[PDB]
A paper describes a structure:
The Legionella effector protein SidC and its paralog SdcA have been shown to be required for the recruitment of ER proteins and ubiquitin signals to the LCV during an infection. Our previous work has further shown that the SidC and SdcA are bona fide Ub E3 ligases. Although SidC has no sequence or structural homology to any other E3s, the catalytic SNL domain of SidC contains two lobes, a smaller INS lobe that mediates the binding with E2 and a larger main lobe that carries the catalytic cysteine. To gain insight into the molecular basis of the ubiquitination reaction catalyzed by SidC/SdcA, we determined crystal structures of two SidC/SdcA complexes: a binary complex of the SNL domain of SdcA with the E2 UbcH5C and a ternary complex of the SNL domain of SidC with the E2 UbcH7 covalently linked to ubiquitin (UbcH7~Ub).
To overcome the labile nature of a thioester bond, the catalytic cysteines of both UbcH5C and UbcH7 were mutated to lysine to form an E2~Ub complex linked by a stable isopeptide bond. In addition, to enhance the stability of the E3s, the catalytic cysteines of SidC (C46) and SdcA (C45) were mutated to alanine. Although the crystals diffracted poorly with the conventional flash-frozen cryoprotection method, the crystals diffracted to 2.9 Å when cryo-cooled under high-pressure. The SidC-UbcH7~Ub complex has a more globular, compact structure. UbcH7 interacts with both the main and INS lobes of the SNL domain. The Ub moiety is tightly clamped between the INS and main lobes, filling the space under the ‘arch’. Remarkably, the distance between the two Cα atoms of the catalytic residues of the E2 (C86K) and the E3 (C46A) is reduced to ~9 Å (from ~80 Å in the binary complex) and the C-terminal carbonyl group of the donor Ub is within attacking distance from the modeled sulfhydryl group of C46A on SidC. This dramatic structural rearrangement is mainly caused by a swinging motion made by the E2-binding INS lobe. Notably, the C-terminal tail of the donor Ub adopts a β-strand conformation and pairs in parallel with a short β-strand upstream of the catalytic cysteine. Strikingly, R74 of the donor Ub forms a bidentate salt bridge with the highly conserved SidC D43 and a salt bridge with another conserved aspartic residue D51.
Author numbering:
A (entry chain B): 1 to 153
B (entry chain C): -1 to 76
C (entry chain A): 8 to 509
The structure:
Amino acid sequence: MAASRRLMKELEEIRKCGMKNFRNIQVDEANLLTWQGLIVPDNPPYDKGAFRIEINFPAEYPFKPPKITFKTKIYHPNIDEKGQVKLPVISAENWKPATKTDQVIQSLIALVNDPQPEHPLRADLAEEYSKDRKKFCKNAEEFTKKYGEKRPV
Amino acid sequence: GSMQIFVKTLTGKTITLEVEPSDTIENVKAKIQDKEGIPPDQQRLIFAGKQLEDGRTLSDYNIQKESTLHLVLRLRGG
Amino acid sequence: VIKFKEPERCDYLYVDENNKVHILLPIVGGDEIGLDNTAQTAVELITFFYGSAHSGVTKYSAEHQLSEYKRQLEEDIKAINSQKKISPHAYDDLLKEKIERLQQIEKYIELIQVLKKQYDEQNDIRQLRTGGIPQLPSGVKEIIKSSENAFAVRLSPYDNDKFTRFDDPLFNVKRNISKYDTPSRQAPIPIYEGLGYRLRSTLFPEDKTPTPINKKSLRDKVKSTVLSHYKDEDRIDGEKKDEKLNELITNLQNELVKELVKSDPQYSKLSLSKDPRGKEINYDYLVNSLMLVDNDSEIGDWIDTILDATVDSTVWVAQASSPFYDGAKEISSDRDADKISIRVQYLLAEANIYCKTNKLSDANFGEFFDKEPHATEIAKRVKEGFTQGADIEPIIYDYINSNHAELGLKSPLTGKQQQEITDKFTKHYNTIKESPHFDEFFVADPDKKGNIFSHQGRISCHFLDFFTRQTKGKHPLGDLASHQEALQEGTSNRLHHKNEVV
């Protein structure tokens, strides 16, 4: 209920303005606690594709953060094969209820743009990023174009 | 000027800690590791419904002279 | 007196009444229920053999720390050998003690070397990062599999994971297809049978008929007490908006603390003026920052918001009869049902653990309750319980008791037995309540006799158990032949984190 009310207000700000990075926002009409949308990266190796994410808001939102999940596959140190992301803003550690989904997505775009080999989820890749970057960008570029969604207009 | 504090598990025996209010929360969690063998990364401390962050001191949270703290187990997730 | 370097405590290292040195191999962090999940799932193992740098903090291998321990023994021997001028010809047997530890700790260090290269061909140990998240070594699996006191349980969350880490869970039930195991990776595919499914489809049906959860909580009472001084068309607005709010907060704060200290005095210092990070609760914050309320909002929503914003969640549980009532008022979504379906399952799993560790029954309760009409019935009883506001735990114990013969029990569970399960359930379940995933848990009972221990907040087995299993027995121990046996003869499987020296 309260979470839903807060989520409707957030939605109105986006219908009014909106984020260029986060498009096609579709939501569960019934509850608003599940969103789907598309994020379009701007820097290689991901300029060639776009990705579907799912946002799940806890019933207790906003006192508890949402979580993000890539539904499109992606080649990235901080992203799970399963699509899960550790993203500092959502960390239970850091989370502030004042934060809006808008900022979370901005953080996500930033994470995608600038991989962080520090607490990475795929060390297998995290190492190939630190060293031998050139093939990595090849690999990611191909993975993106093969398993990645097509870009908008 | 060094204090005696109490620390309570949700369902097991209260214990006692020799400290002074300069001490870090992190430090409290280590004197607990000392008494109980519980690693600090498994410890979540609450004081009168306010959660304590690792870095701040006892004086920050207004804790002194026989305060009764709530200890609770913490999951550890990557 | 002489400075002694040998530390009363070392990682993984325990010494019994008879100066015997046991090295305990950590399966997972925890005491009774495992606390690691996601990218930490296998840390304690990884760190044991290869050390660890995460958060940029150095953590030394077991091998490394035994080397470190050994040097401090070696120094502690030289500083007594040096002192033979005033020597008693013995140090009250302290030297005897201190050299015994050296002979043992040196056998341990051989053994570690021996697993890395001669008996590590299978690479069970050498499995880190190969599979995404590493699987438990075969020796560990064998050890866990035969355990009399530690047990895994697998459950049925609506949105389950494909792979499971524990291969022989005591409690186990039917699950859907994981979304990650579908061509599109978008959603799980649901099965239409078993415990998990009847629970979810009963508690929140396709008709979308919410299921009421009728119980007054301490919080519910405080709300009504405070609302009893307002009228239904009171609001927060005018230029006196701000002041009215501070009245509301101050009233709320007193009545809350008044009801709280009745049973826990710790909360007399409880304030509601700040959030946890120091931010004054005011009209700006809750209306413009948060957007949870506004001038038009009723006083109720004003109260709930303040409480949500200010009170740590522990405050509500310590004051509650069970995890079943988390303060929600109705089951109104598939998600709500999932959470409750899990509660119920986890409670059975705990009942199933009690009965196993106490030698009441060898059954998988999950298999029983998956079967119709038990699946359908138990869901029905539970939906009912939430409505009448009756306690949920005994509906499960009542059902289990109606079927004790089938479940492998000589006789129904006492109300005492029942309570032990409720105490364990509540402690454990509350601990893992915020887990990222509810596919499985690993619960252990170090008060019982068996092959699994608790040491320094690690759910652990004996390094020699594992060693012997891994090398298929081909390498014998020498003087560590019955260290393993000795430890299980010890009066407890729950081990002190320090050693005795003097």
